[PDB]
């Protein structure tokens, strides 16, 4: 599971890891704070215009990814 | 021999273990997953 060395030796072994588990292995690897209160404080305030936009430098035809 | 299989079969049991990092996740972190929702809206 969780271990620096466990992880360091699975992700070279078994190799990566897969995606349901993003959240326990960085999370513990990269000292995540899971600091979810700052996160929504800038998940909600409103239009922001310096990214309306992404589509005419990078043309991802994806409307619900580019979003 | 054993760069082959003894290392690749005991190197299966990362999984074996690994599969279940998930029942932790719903059980380690959760409650923030948990707060969120609700902090949100």
Redesign the interface.
């Given at each position: 599971?969780?271990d620096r060395e466990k992880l360091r030796?699975?992700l070279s072994?078994?190799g990566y890891?897969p995606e349901?588990?993003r959240?326990?292995?960085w999370?513990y690897l990269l000292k995540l704070p899971?600091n979810?209160?700052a996160?929504?404080n800038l998940?909600?305030k409103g239009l922001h215009p310096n990214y309306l936009n992404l589509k005419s430098t990078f043309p991802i035809q994806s409307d619900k990814l580019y979003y | 021999n054993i760069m082959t299989e003894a290392?690749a079969a005991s190197?299966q049991q990362?999984?074996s273990?690994?599969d279940?990092?998930?029942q932790?996740?719903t059980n380690?972190?959760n409650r923030?997953v948990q707060?969120?929702q609700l902090?949100?809206s």
């Open positions: 599971f969780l030796e699975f072994r078994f890891f349901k588990h959240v326990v292995v999370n899971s979810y209160e996160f929504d998940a909600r | 290392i190197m990362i999984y273990r690994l279940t990092m998930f932790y996740m380690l972190e923030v707060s969120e902090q949100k």
